[PDB]
Amino acid sequence: AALSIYLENYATSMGSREQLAIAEFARSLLVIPNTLAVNAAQDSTDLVAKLRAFHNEAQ
Amino acid sequence: QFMEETERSLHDAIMIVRRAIKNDSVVAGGGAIEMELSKYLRDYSRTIPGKQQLLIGAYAKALEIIPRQLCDN
Amino acid sequence: KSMIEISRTQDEEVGDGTTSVIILAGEMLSVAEHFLEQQMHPTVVISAYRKALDDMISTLKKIS
């Protein structure tokens, strides 16, 4: 989740088409909490939204 | 045909200036605010969600489509 | 084919009750599953199947 936070700023100040490529690479990062909660028989979209909600800065 | 576009050139200045008088509270045009508001509200998608980053992210996804279309038209 | 294999399991340990092990296993997955796999929680029903086992064990000591 934090790598997705680490890359959206890295997308934002990049410039051109590469910005959208950094962001969709961060969309591939989100599947790892997603496959676990389904395997743990829980909600994936809830749990990953909990993760990013715990934050001060991206570390 | 030059005067057809010239009339609608003048008509745009009539529409925007009458609108500028009735509301002094004026921002920039061209969807310039929306791209900021796209990134502004995805920060709330970073901030708030229990599940709401799917919605506010989609909300902020649709905001940049207007200057996207204004580039695409 | 796996129903034969768990019947081979009961046969090699006992040989009896192999008729009966396949009877009980049907309605476990017949009754619970479609109500809950439309809700899709596989792991919870596994742990529910865990706690169905040991409660039966203590109840065996109650009745025997």
Side-chain angles (χ1 to χ4, degrees):
Chain A
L3 278 165
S4 296
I5 304 308
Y6 183 75
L7 264 59
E8 286 172 351
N9 294 317
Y10 180 71
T12 305
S13 297
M14 179 55 67
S16 297
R17 294 172 184 262
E18 308 294 324
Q19 169 168 0
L20 187 56
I22 294 154
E24 294 294 327
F25 189 79
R27 300 282 75 76
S28 295
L29 297 173
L30 298 174
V31 71
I32 303 306
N34 287 319
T35 182
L36 182 61
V38 172
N39 286 317
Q42 297 180 359
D43 291 331
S44 291
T45 62
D46 289 332
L47 182 62
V48 68
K50 297 295 183 181
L51 292 168
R52 296 175 64 186
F54 291 111
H55 64 277
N56 191 2
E57 294 295 325
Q59 184 65 41
Chain B
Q1 301 303 112
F2 185 80
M3 180 169 63
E4 290 178 351
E5 294 292 327
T6 309
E7 185 183 6
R8 293 177 289 176
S9 302
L10 292 169
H11 181 75
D12 195 5
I14 299 174
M15 291 298 289
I16 194 54
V17 170
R18 289 182 292 172
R19 187 60 182 170
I21 292 188
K22 297 295 288 184
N23 203 172
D24 54 352
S25 177
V26 169
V27 297
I33 310 299
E34 296 173 351
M35 299 174 290
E36 179 68 32
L37 286 173
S38 300
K39 182 175 68 180
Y40 180 71
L41 295 170
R42 291 184 184 96
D43 296 331
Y44 292 101
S45 298
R46 184 259 183 94
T47 302
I48 199 178
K51 60 185 177 181
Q52 300 297 106
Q53 64 187 3
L54 301 176
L55 277 303
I56 302 173
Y59 185 84
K61 181 66 174 65
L63 296 174
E64 64 184 1
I65 305 303
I66 299 107
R68 184 176 301 277
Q69 182 56 251
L70 286 175
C71 296
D72 288 331
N73 59 17
Chain C
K1 297 178 176 65
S2 298
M3 295 299 289
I4 303 178
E5 294 294 325
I6 58 109
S7 294
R8 292 296 95 194
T9 303
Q10 186 67 40
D11 186 74
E12 292 174 354
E13 66 181 3
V14 179
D16 195 2
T18 65
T19 307
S20 299
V21 292
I22 59 187
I23 303 306
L24 298 173
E27 293 87 10
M28 294 177 183
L29 299 173
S30 300
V31 178
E33 181 170 359
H34 64 283
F35 291 111
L36 299 176
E37 295 295 323
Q38 67 189 356
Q39 298 175 355
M40 194 63 71
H41 50 86
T43 309
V44 181
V45 183
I46 292 162
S47 64
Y49 287 164
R50 296 297 302 160
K51 301 291 184 179
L53 181 65
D54 53 352
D55 186 74
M56 182 268 179
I57 297 175
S58 298
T59 314
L60 283 175
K61 298 296 183 182
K62 294 176 180 67
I63 193 176
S64 298

